């Protein structure tokens, strides 16, 4: 063959040193991030639980022992402390970044080191959206939004001060203090102009801090709150990176439909994986405001 | 003030005389009770230096 | 050549000169250059071997290839 024009790929996730018009990307400039990368909101709000298997067994207290008033020489009666079991399991996150070895020599030789922060951000966003919003084909079944559906613990209507109070009061109605608000950063437009109960000087709502989510699944009109100490997470495997120069990739295909052999085609790929786990210690601890 | 922790729902929305920044009501501190006998709609206050206690036997 | 591509630049025009009388105005002149470029391409081959061959027939094979 001796065909010299560059390889077309599908899904086209492969980084390449030359474009099909013949532009070789020599003298390339290292990108700079526009914003700053987000941390995990679950890891910010939830309780950590040291875990070393892929699964954990909890014990929590449930019933406190009582006490009695006894007259002089009257019989002291007995009482029982009680506990309840709970369990949480991990699931695996992972991604692969395929690269043509010319790109790693001539375009951007630090690429796989400069990607590690962005890979971590991708996993944190994937974790938050799975555990809070029940989105992105979450594996746990356990989630905040799925708890609120089960309890049906939902206020209907707009961001009136009465509804912002009723939202929190629906947790006080079971002796739980709210501890934070989860908000779509776009909906300050509503929380500003009600009467004030909000302030932007801190981003707090009735003195509790607001945490912004930053994804398309949480709409304008919706607000979430709860006792976030009842949300528990663990990480059996901190992110592990493996770089490979010879494996096949089956998910990316050549122009003719063949899998991508990294050895024949002179390529490199970075695999990253992480194990992460979620538990909701009390499904009543979260409540939501939803537009009608 | 002695309050059922559930009734901030009412003390928040009146006009403000309450603040949650401290849990105070007209500048006096609010103490929450945490039992089923003090209802939603009820509030208690007084000069608590007039209430006196003692403990002859520590547990 | 460090990258897969290289640039060249060369002179093309050289300035003139004039004859001027005493107290006549001296005139101007101009230089010029031109550019050229070259790029690299990749050569390759693979030689496969059954590992019995590399043990019981021709141990040195790759060093002779």
């Amino acid at each position: 063959s001796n065909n010299v024009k560059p390889q077309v790929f599908n899904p086209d996730n492969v980084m390449m040193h030359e474009k099909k018009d013949g532009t070789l990307m020599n003298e390339f400039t290292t990108p700079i991030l526009q914003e700053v990368m987000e941390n995990s909101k679950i890891m910010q709000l939830g309780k950590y639980e040291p875990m070393e298997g892929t699964e954990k067994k909890f014990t929590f207290w449930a019933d406190k022992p009582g006490a009695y008033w006894v007259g002089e020489g009257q019989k002291i009666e007995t009482s029982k402390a009680t506990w309840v079991n709970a369990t949480m399991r991990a699931f695996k996150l992972g991604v692969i970044l395929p690269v043509t070895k010319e790109f790693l020599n001539y375009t951007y030789s630090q690429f796989f080191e400069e990607m590690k922060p962005m890979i971590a951000e991708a996993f944190y966003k994937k974790f938050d959206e799975a555990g809070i919003l029940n989105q992105g084909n979450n594996p746990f079944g356990k989630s905040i939004a799925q708890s609120i559906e089960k309890t049906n613990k939902v206020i209907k209507g707009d961001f009136t001060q009465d509804n912002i109070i009723d939202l929190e009061a629906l947790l006080e109605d079971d002796e739980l203090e709210a501890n934070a608000f989860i908000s779509k950063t776009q909906n300050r437009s509503l929380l500003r102009k009600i009467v004030r109960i909000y302030d932007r000087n801190s981003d707090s709502l009735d003195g509790l801090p607001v945490v912004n989510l930053k994804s398309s699944n949480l709409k304008r009109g919706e607000l979430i709150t709860g006792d976030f100490d009842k949300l528990i997470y663990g990480i059996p495997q901190l992110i592990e990176y493996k770089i490979d120069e010879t494996a096949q990739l089956s998910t990316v295909k050549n122009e003719d439909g063949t899998p991508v052999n990294l050895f024949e085609q002179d390529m490199v790929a970075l695999r990253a994986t992480m194990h992460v786990a979620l538990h909701i210690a009390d499904d009543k601890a979260f409540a939501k405001l939803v537009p009608a």
Side-chain angles (χ1 to χ4, degrees), chain A:
Chain A
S1 306
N2 297 303
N3 184 47
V4 289
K5 58 174 61 178
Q7 182 63 73
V8 168
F9 295 101
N10 189 351
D12 201 17
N13 285 9
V14 184
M15 303 307 286
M16 295 217 289
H17 178 72
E18 72 179 292
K19 306 182 186 180
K20 72 179 296 184
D21 71 8
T23 305
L24 276 66
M25 304 193 305
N26 287 301
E27 308 300 349
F28 177 89
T29 303
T30 306
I32 183 61
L33 182 63
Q34 298 188 261
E35 300 193 56
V36 184
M37 64 192 65
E38 293 296 326
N39 190 17
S40 164
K41 310 310 170 179
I42 284 179
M43 297 174 61
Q44 172 168 339
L45 288 174
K47 201 192 76 72
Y48 185 63
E49 180 69 20
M51 190 187 313
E52 70 181 347
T54 59
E55 187 166 54
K56 190 74 177 186
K57 300 297 179 73
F58 293 94
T59 293
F60 301 125
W61 297 108
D63 307 327
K64 302 301 183 68
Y68 309 93
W69 301 107
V70 306
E72 184 166 41
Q74 293 283 4
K75 294 182 179 179
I76 300 168
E77 299 197 345
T78 57
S79 196
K80 181 182 183 175
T82 314
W83 54 76
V84 69
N85 301 321
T87 186
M88 81 198 292
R89 64 153 292 161
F91 286 90
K92 190 174 63 185
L93 288 172
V95 77
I96 301 179
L97 301 185
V99 173
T100 303
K101 189 142 49 70
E102 284 92 317
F103 175 95
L104 208 72
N105 291 338
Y106 305 131
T107 315
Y108 188 2
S109 198
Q110 299 301 332
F111 178 79
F112 291 140
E113 301 301 334
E114 304 311 329
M115 280 290 107
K116 290 174 182 170
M118 299 193 77
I119 291 162
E121 175 171 49
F123 292 165
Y124 296 155
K125 294 186 74 173
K126 191 72 177 187
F127 181 35
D128 295 342
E129 188 146 64
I132 300 161
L133 304 177
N134 203 72
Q135 276 297 350
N137 299 100
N138 69 335
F140 303 114
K142 299 174 173 64
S143 65
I144 290 183
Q146 188 58 83
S147 299
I148 296 181
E149 286 280 20
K150 168 170 48 158
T151 54
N152 204 1
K153 204 169 180 79
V154 176
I155 308 298
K156 278 287 188 75
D158 304 336
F159 290 7
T160 68
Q161 174 170 326
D162 313 73
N163 282 343
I164 289 158
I165 289 170
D166 284 357
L167 172 66
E168 182 176 348
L170 186 55
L171 299 173
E172 298 182 311
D173 191 47
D174 203 10
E175 199 56 53
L176 292 175
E177 293 196 322
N179 193 37
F181 286 93
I182 283 175
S183 302
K184 180 57 161 169
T185 187
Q186 301 179 337
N187 79 10
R188 288 186 190 86
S189 178
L190 295 173
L191 295 176
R192 263 294 194 192
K193 50 182 180 178
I194 186 59
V195 66
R196 292 190 177 97
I197 191 157
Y198 169 76
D199 75 82
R200 194 164 176 170
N201 185 38
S202 67
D203 275 319
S204 303
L205 187 67
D206 208 2
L208 295 176
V210 179
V211 177
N212 288 291
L213 269 176
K214 206 162 178 172
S215 76
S216 63
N217 288 291
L218 187 67
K219 311 308 189 301
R220 188 89 81 149
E222 297 178 20
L223 184 69
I224 289 166
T225 190
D227 182 11
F228 287 92
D229 286 342
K230 302 297 189 286
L231 180 149
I232 307 178
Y233 78 98
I235 298 170
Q237 172 181 117
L238 291 164
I239 307 168
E240 293 191 359
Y241 299 103
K242 206 282 184 195
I243 188 163
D244 202 283
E245 300 174 40
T246 188
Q248 177 181 311
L249 307 181
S250 194
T251 52
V252 189
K253 289 177 174 173
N254 291 132
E255 193 174 35
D256 67 17
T258 311
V260 175
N261 295 329
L262 297 175
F263 185 77
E264 288 190 302
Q265 305 189 24
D266 206 20
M267 297 181 58
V268 191
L270 175 76
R271 182 186 72 198
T273 61
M274 189 183 185
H275 282 80
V276 68
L278 181 71
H279 196 263
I280 304 297
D282 183 359
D283 59 20
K284 304 177 297 168
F286 302 98
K288 192 178 183 187
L289 175 64
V290 181

